[PDB]
Amino acid sequence: TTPFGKPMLKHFCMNPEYRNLNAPSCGSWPKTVRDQWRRYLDDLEAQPDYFSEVKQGPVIQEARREVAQLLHARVSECVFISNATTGIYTVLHNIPFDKDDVIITFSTTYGAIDNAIASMAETQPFQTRKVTVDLPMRGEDIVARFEGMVAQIKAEGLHPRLAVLETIVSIPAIRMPFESLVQACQREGVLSLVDGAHSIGQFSLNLEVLQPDFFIMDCHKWLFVPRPCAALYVPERNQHYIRSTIPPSFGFIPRDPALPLWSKQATDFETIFAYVATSDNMPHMCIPTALKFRREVCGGEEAIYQYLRVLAKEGGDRVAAILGTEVLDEEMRDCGIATVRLPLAVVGPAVHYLSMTLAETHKTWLPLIDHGGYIWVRLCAQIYLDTSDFEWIGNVLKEICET
Amino acid sequence: TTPFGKPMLKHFCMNPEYRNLNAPSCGSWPKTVRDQWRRYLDDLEAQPDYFSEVKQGPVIQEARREVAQLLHARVSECVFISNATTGIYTVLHNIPFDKDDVIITFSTTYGAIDNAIASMAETQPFQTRKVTVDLPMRGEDIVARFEGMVAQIKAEGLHPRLAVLETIVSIPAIRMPFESLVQACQREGVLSLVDGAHSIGQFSLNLEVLQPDFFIMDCHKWLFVPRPCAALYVPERNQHYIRSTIPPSFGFIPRDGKPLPLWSKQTDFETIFAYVATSDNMPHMCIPTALKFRREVCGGEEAIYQYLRVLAKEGGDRVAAILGTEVLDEKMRDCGIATVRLPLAVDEEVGPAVHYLSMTLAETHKTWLPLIDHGGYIWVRLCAQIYLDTSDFEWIGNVLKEICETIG
């Protein structure tokens, strides 16, 4: 129906002068999703306990199966959680660890995940090792160092119990060889915890094929729903590991489960995530409206995936050209993101100036990070941007760097 | 400006037919809070990263200052969290327990807390003890048993480390002697963790006097903001215990003690709770609007607390009378809640009968009430609120009367 690029802008809710080149942070959703969101709010306000006790569940259930379909997963293997940090932590906290078990991470592992592993180590006897990854690198070189780490662990008498993998590194943002790492994990008997915070809605994905041990995803990052909105995939074979949400609630399963009588006013795994602490569900309840908008107005998932990839390839390349620099690359760019190096060498006041300038003067926002002695910027394509927006931010960044 | 009761309904957003006798579960909020909430949603989708990075912060900080003043606490002792379960678990998870420490609970402890303590013991070597509380009791006998459990624990050579107290039991709902239990805790050197999920907005609080070791509250349950909306109070003397949110995030404090990446350029205790996983903040951002409505439209906090307590007392009594049963008391009602026994005694039948009652209220009578089995009978929890009056309570009394007859 509507061509990609700035024709799409009329379907979304941003101010006219707002270049959204960092959509996954807060999400970005069409007007159809906004209006449906507000109708649920109206419903909640008009009859709160009726909306919550009767009307909420069936929309949630429809959202679950639409997410499972998109994943080529069973609805029985997909549960909803508030954010990706919660899902990853829920898995880590439930897996029983022994002093001879090793948790394998990478230097690309999300910072919040390192902190969780550090925190857990204070009261548990396991140990951890970080596979060094200095991007740029080749996917098969990453996969080889992982296999070398797993082999070194087994040689010392230790047990490589779990590896933390990611689909997209948060920043500097590339696509990682997660399909190959999941395979290496299954060969060596290592559980594959996949941080797919950036995945669903951005590129095609098939868990029936990939078969990860655990897969966590932020729907709000790329599925046109507001934050926070995440999902956790656990295959049947691993559902026995999960006995408690984080924080624990009435769904808890002791090692040796009883719902209070008000529960009578679905497997054990599913009840764990049905009886949880008080929460808002309306981002998840927006999933069907979002997927409808993507089928009918945007021409389906594959079209969107292609446009995002192609725009990021071309738009990222054009920003690097204008800057005289490069795009992060060893496919690592088989996604809707481009991480471009800025011509600055490494700080705080400068970072603060750059960002407020983009937010105050140019009405956009970009994440950045120090890596390899230079400051890099993450640019996120999306179906209402076109190649000129990237050309625009290239010149803007050019001017600020000069300044 | 507006008298309490049905004159308040014009200021709220419920259907005219709907009777909200269970407001704490989702919260109920005035039109001014609704309208402010939609205005934030407009701003968030007009300027997502500008709203989030520059505009949220000062509203959130204003809300923290107002919560701190409502509690008689310092701002730097009050942080925001999603829900009370998260806040209680954050405290429990941060405290280092050894194998000779004991966590004291009660028969009335929220079941989610019991599960957290059970979950935590699979991995930590501490023990726990439960004080027996078989309501109805007198509050002073509850204190006597707590003090006895503390002495018994010491008698075994163990260490009574922390006690989980609550202000209001979830179900069946009474006000517990939390002031006396906190006082007993400090006499004996026990950390007082107060589950005050029901507290702020319902009755008067003064943490400067109470001095609890930790205090967790659901703002949405009684402060006129939407769920989920909680706050956590940790006095200065106890903030060294808290080093991570649940789940841990970028604010984590290594046990060494040094806490951020470069994009943060774009109090350590307060920082823990500022750098968290992606979340919504607009309920907390509605706190200033809600509190202004309560001052300007409702005549202030103390006027609201008095109306809630008097209505729950008179309304609760009227439901008990119509049913020929009773209200739960100490044979504790200094709150806006009344728990009334249904003339139904307690198998395979309870579930279906409970389900019929519930949907009959939801589908037919346009209300909802939480149920529990206690002492061989079924009890119901009723919550007074400033847009209700005593006629709403005799309505539900007759309605419940008539339904119990059907089941019987």
Residue A373 CB neighbours (<10 A) = 8
Q: How many CA atoms lie within 13 A of A96 on its CB side?
A: 10
In a domain, A196, yes or no: yes
Closest CA to A143 of A179, A101, A190, A195: A179
- Please classify residue B349 by burial: count the beta carbons closer than 10 Å to its beta carbon, then call 0-12 exposed, 13-18 middle and 19+ buried: exposed
Q: Does A34 touch chain B (CB under 8 A)?
A: yes
Q: What is the CATH number of the domain that holds A344?
A: 3.90.1150.10
Residues B319, B233 share a domain: no
* Three-state helix/strand/coil letters over chain A: CCCCCHHHHHHECCCCCCCCCCCCCCCCCEHHHHHHHHHHHHHHHHCHHHHHHHHHHHHHHHHHHHHHHHHCCCHHHEEEECCHHHHHHHHHHHCCCCCCEEEEEECCCCHHHHHHHHHHHCCCCCEEEEECCCCCCCHHHHHHHHHHHHHHHHHCCCEEEEEEEECECCCCCCECCHHHHHHHHHHHCCEEEEEECCCCCCCCCCHHHHCCCEEEEEHHHHCCCCCCCEEEECCHHHHHHCCCCCCCCCCCCCCCCCCCHHHHCCCHHHHHCCCCCCCCCHHHHCHHHHHHHHHHCCCCHHHHHHHHHHHHHHHHHHHHHHHCCCECCCCCCCCCEEEEEEEEECCHHHHHHHHHHHHHHHCCCCCEEEECCEEEEEEECCCCCCHHHHHHHHHHHHHHHHC
Q: Which residues of B are annotated as a binding site for pyridoxal 5'-phosphate?
A: 84-85, 110, 198, 278
Closest CA to B266 of A170, A48, A132, A348: A348
Closest CA to A379 of A306, A319, A323: A319
In a domain, A366, yes or no: yes
Task: Give the three-class secondary structure for B135.
Answer: coil
In a domain, A263, yes or no: no
In a domain, B35, yes or no: no
Which residue type does B383 have? C
Closest CA to A382 of A171, A169, A221, A172: A221
User: Which residues, 6 or more positions from A137, have their beta carbon under 8 angstroms from its beta carbon?
Assistant: A330
Burial B21-59, CB ≥16 within 10 A → b, else e:
bbbbbbbbbbebbbebbeebbebbbebbbbbbbeebeeb
Q: Does B26 touch chain A (CB under 8 A)?
A: yes
Residues A212, A356 share a domain: no
Q: Which of B248, B264, B289 is the last residue of a domain?
A: B289
In a domain, B34, yes or no: no
In a domain, B284, yes or no: yes
Residues A230, A149 share a domain: yes
Residue B212 CB neighbours (<10 A) = 25
Q: Which residues from A are below 8 Å from B54, CB to CB?
A: 359
The full DSSP string for B199-247 is: -TTTS---HHHH--SEEEEEGGGTSS-PSS-EEEE--GGGGGG----SS
Residues A141, A12 share a domain: no
Q: How many CA atoms lie within 13 A of B155 on its CB side?
A: 6
User: Which residues, 6 or more positions from B105, have their beta carbon under 8 angstroms from its beta carbon?
Assistant: B113, B114, B117, B128, B129, B130, B131, B163, B164
Residues B87, B20 share a domain: no
Method of structure determination: X-ray
Q: Which of B289, B313, B347 is the last residue of a domain?
A: B289
Q: How far is CA B15 from CA A46, A231, B10, B239, B400, in A?
A: 5, 33, 10, 44, 21
Residue B206 CB neighbours (<10 A) = 11
Residues B148, B111 share a domain: yes
Residues B212, B187 share a domain: yes
In a domain, B47, yes or no: yes
Query: How far is it, in rounded angstroms, from Cα B313 to Cα B328?
Result: 11
Chain A, window 146-185: residues with a beta carbon less than 8 angstroms from a chain B beta carbon: 171
Give me the sign of the Cα torsion angle B346, B352, B358, B363.
Answer: negative
Q: What is the CATH number of the domain that holds B67?
A: 3.40.640.10
CA B382 to chain centre: 15
Backbone phi, then psi, for A160, in 5-degree steps? -75, 100
The verdict on whether omega for the bond into residue A172 sits within 30 degrees of 0, i.e. cis, is: yes
Q: Which residues from A are below 8 Å from B255, CB to CB?
A: 122
Q: Which residues from B are below 8 Å from A172, CB to CB?
A: none
Q: What is the largest CA-CA distance in chain B?
A: 67
Task: Give the three-class secondary structure for B64.
Answer: helix
How many residues in chain A?
403
Query: How far is it, in rounded angstroms, from Cα A154 to Cα A150?
Result: 6
Closest CA to A196 of A311, A81, A75: A81
In a domain, B36, yes or no: no
Optimal mutation site among B35, B224, B252, B266, interface A, most CBs of chain A within 10 A: B266
Closest CA to B371 of B341, B345, B398, B393: B341
DSSP state of B170: S
User: Which residues, 6 or more positions from B58, have their beta carbon under 8 angstroms from its beta carbon?
Assistant: none
Residues B116, B196 share a domain: yes
Question: What is the residue whose two structure tokens read 């599913």?
Answer: A270
Residues B309, B281 share a domain: no
Cβ contacts from A onto B, under 8 A: 238
CB A110 within 8 A of CB A123: no
Q: Which of B289, B316, B343 is the last residue of a domain?
A: B289
Helix (H) or strand (E) holding B79: strand B78-81
User: Which residues, 6 or more positions from A342, have their beta carbon under 8 angstroms from its beta carbon?
Assistant: A323, A325, A368, A374, A375, A376, A377, A397, A401
- Look up residue B201 and give its two tokens: 């907005």
User: Which residues, 6 or more positions from B16, have their beta carbon under 8 angstroms from its beta carbon?
Assistant: B9
CB B380 within 8 A of CB B347: no
Q: For residue A363, what are the β-bridge partners?
A: none
Closest CA to B384 of B330, B300, B325, B317: B317
The domain tally of chain B equals 2
Residues A330, A237 share a domain: no
Residues A134, A159 share a domain: yes
Residues B190, B145 share a domain: yes
Q: How far is CA B231 from CA A84, B68, B129, B169, B246, in A?
A: 22, 10, 27, 18, 14
Query: How far is it, in rounded angstroms, from Cα B86 to Cα B80?
Result: 11
Helix (H) or strand (E) holding B182: helix B178-187
Which residue type does B380 have? V
Sheet holding A101-106, edge to edge: A78-81, A230-233, A214-218, A191-196, A159-166, A101-106, A127-131
Domain that holds residue A114: 42-242+279-289
Query: How far is it, in rounded angstroms, from Cα A196 to Cα A13?
Result: 27
